[PDB]
Amino acid sequence: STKVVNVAVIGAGVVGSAFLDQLLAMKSTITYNLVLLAEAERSLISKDFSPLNVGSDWKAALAASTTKTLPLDDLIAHLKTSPKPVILVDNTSSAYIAGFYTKFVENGISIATPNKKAFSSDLATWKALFSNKPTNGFVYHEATVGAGLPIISFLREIIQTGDEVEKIEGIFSGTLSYIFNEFSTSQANDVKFSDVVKVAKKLGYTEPDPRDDLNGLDVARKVTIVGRISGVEVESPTSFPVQSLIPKPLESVKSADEFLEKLSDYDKDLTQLKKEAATENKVLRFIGKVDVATKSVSVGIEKYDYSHPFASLKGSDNVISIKTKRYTNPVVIQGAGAGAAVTAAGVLGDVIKIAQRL
Amino acid sequence: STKVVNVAVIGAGVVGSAFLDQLLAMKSTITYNLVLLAEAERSLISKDFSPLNVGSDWKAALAASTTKTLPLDDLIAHLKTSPKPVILVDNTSSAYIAGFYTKFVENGISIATPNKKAFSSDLATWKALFSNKPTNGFVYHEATVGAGLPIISFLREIIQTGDEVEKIEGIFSGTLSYIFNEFSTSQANDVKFSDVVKVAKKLGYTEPDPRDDLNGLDVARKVTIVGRISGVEVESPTSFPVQSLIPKPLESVKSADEFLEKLSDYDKDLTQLKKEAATENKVLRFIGKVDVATKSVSVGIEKYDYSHPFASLKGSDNVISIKTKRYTNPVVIQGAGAGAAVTAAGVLGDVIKIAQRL
Numbered sequence A, B: 001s002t003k004v005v006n007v008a009v010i011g012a013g014v015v016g017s018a019f020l021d022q023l024l025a026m027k028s029t030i031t032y033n034l035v036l037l038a039e040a041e042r043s044l045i046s047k048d049f050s051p052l053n054v055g056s057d058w059k060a061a062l063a064a065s066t067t068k069t070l071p072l073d074d075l076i077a078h079l080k081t082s083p084k085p086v087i088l089v090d091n092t093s094s095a096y097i098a099g100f101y102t103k104f105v106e107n108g109i110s111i112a113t114p115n116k117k118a119f120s121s122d123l124a125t126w127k128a129l130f131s132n133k134p135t136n137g138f139v140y141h142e143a144t145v146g147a148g149l150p151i152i153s154f155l156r157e158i159i160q161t162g163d164e165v166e167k168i169e170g171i172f173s174g175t176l177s178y179i180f181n182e183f184s185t186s187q188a189n190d191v192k193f194s195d196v197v198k199v200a201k202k203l204g205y206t207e208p209d210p211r212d213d214l215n216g217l218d219v220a221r222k223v224t225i226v227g228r229i230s231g232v233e234v235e236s237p238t239s240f241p242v243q244s245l246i247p248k249p250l251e252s253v254k255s256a257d258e259f260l261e262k263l264s265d266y267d268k269d270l271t272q273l274k275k276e277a278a279t280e281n282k283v284l285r286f287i288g289k290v291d292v293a294t295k296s297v298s299v300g301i302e303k304y305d306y307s308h309p310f311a312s313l314k315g316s317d318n319v320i321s322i323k324t325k326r327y328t329n330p331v332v333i334q335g336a337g338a339g340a341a342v343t344a345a346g347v348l349g350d351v352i353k354i355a356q357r358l
């Protein structure tokens, strides 16, 4: 009969709920059997390995559960006794959970996740991605760079095909892109930096503390990932230039709220640089850059021309320009690099790819 | 994943030669055994299914072959007994070979191809193709539109996750894309359509007869495919408005060389269109619109603000915009939608996806 694959999910946040929904709704010829779901301490564990009885509302089911969440080692031991191939869907961003990735992998358990942690830390844990071992499951992380856009898979494909990436540059942060699309445009603009980031925060786009977006470390993580798949064995997300948008004097301030009240005090610079670029009929963008030839990598601001693909983005789109041996002219892929629905579809799509390979 | 699979390639032309080279020279965790190298009159065929012993120089091998190419009814009669899954790679524009797809699939053999034929035919073939019945070959055609750009596989994924396409539209023809990107730009120019069509020809962007490109027919078949992938049951590439760039009729009435030389008599029309639109800060582009709600697939010229990305294309690149319930703001993918090595990569990309799935 039907081919089955058992799924174990950790986290039911914004991305995790979208994923679960889409997952439980997905029509297909392969059977995606939800056997586990974990959110904080409460957890649904189908000891039997039959589909979790979520009835028609896994939310309530997850609520009324009194099954404590299994310690990680116990999570592996459990999963290891499944009648079918297991796929762990880590919807968290816990570097803790990321520490067990290689343990999960090495025990035949596969992984699909938007979690950037394991993939943008030391090179040897990344090297662990070399799951060519016969006893370990697969590792997919599309939602890890650019939500659900056909990016990492497109690189792995052409590369295997025989192509060679040369230069990759793009916009990998939703928040940062939104800010720059609202701040630096093609038309006359008198908007202050402090205000755009002030609003992005209010709409709920920035992290609880926007300083966590402005230090450009999250894009540096994504860049670290693209750079590696691209052949530039980047040591860490911090081992290369990364321009911080945070005013040095506001680097050590008590609250995310003191930051916002005080930030206004430094519009000066960017207001001028924004202007300067206006004169040159250019725009300002926060990008990541990977130059395979010179093994150089970096993230920061850069002025782009109006006819440039990067000057024509909507809302908070992400963008990635891919230049390769056969692609003299970049393949440039653009679209939403954040949002629950979009991202979950990325995680699930990796679920699909993996379940077929099983 | 799956250790061993058999590749049955048909056609060693522009695309075909590049595919072969790339395949043969590919290093992977899976073994791809070439069990067939078929051409117009002669074919290389591994009667007992051993890897065709054609190291890297297959041409010399094919050449010395006097083994006549097997009619498709006999061919699949052979391949169907293969001890390993069989991936038929059709690198032809053959309607003949296309008519057979349904039989390959029913006999359990998958298909990887850039051949638009079976997918821009009647609705029954399409349904049959994706009937996705047990033990039946899978059918991949990433190269039928946009060469090797991640679009078809992107759509089939987003759709499976649960997303719905609402508005697709793109520049699916390199020769046309080239002409217009050249013809009408943001920077006003005194360029005559006829002069661009002819230069494009001399530079080889065209087919011996530029009418084979101006009739907008290839753009129609490519949109018939996307339309269907999106939920519009298009009866055929000829069941909707398909504006021709050929000087209104006056088609059959002439011939090759004459068409061109006489073409420079209608320019005034298009030149005027290029002007008016220019007044609106817009440009001209030959596209393939696709509206799902209204279920309206069209083809022809359309205006685009300079701001728009369809307005800043490079060389003869392809573009496609994808609005969905989830991506309310279009996912734009642009890049070479033609080219020996890029088109072939797209085909081998599908091969990899299929081998992995078997």
Ligand SMILES: NC(=O)c1c[n+]([C@@H]2O[C@H](COP(=O)(O)OP(=O)(O)OC[C@H]3O[C@@H](n4cnc5c(N)ncnc54)[C@H](O)[C@@H]3O)[C@@H](O)[C@H]2O)ccc1[C@H](O)C(=O)C[C@H](N)C(=O)O
Binding pocket: B010, B011, B012, B013, B014, B015, B016, B038, B039, B040, B069, B091, B092, B093, B094, B096, B097, B114, B115, B116, B143, B144, B145, B146, B147, B172, B173, B174, B175, B176, B205, B218, B337, B338, B339, B340, B343
């Ligand atoms: N080269 C490209 O860039 C490109 C080409 N394709 C598709 O790729 C396929 C092959 O292309 P290509 O190699 O250039 O054409 P070839 O003329 O070289 O044909 C390949 C071989 O097929 C063999 N053949 C025909 N019938 C056969 C049979 N019954 N048995 C065995 N062998 C047989 C012939 O002997 C021939 O040598 C076509 O279906 C084409 O439509 C797919 C997409 C792109 C492209 O977007 C496009 O088609 C549009 C156009 N190029 C544009 O510029 O906009």
Ligand code: NA
Binding pocket: A142, A143, A144, A145, A146, A147, A148, A149, A150, A151, A152, A346
């Ligand atoms: Na992605």
Ligand code: NA
Binding pocket: B142, B143, B144, B145, B146, B147, B148, B149, B150, B151, B152, B346
């Ligand atoms: Na494509």
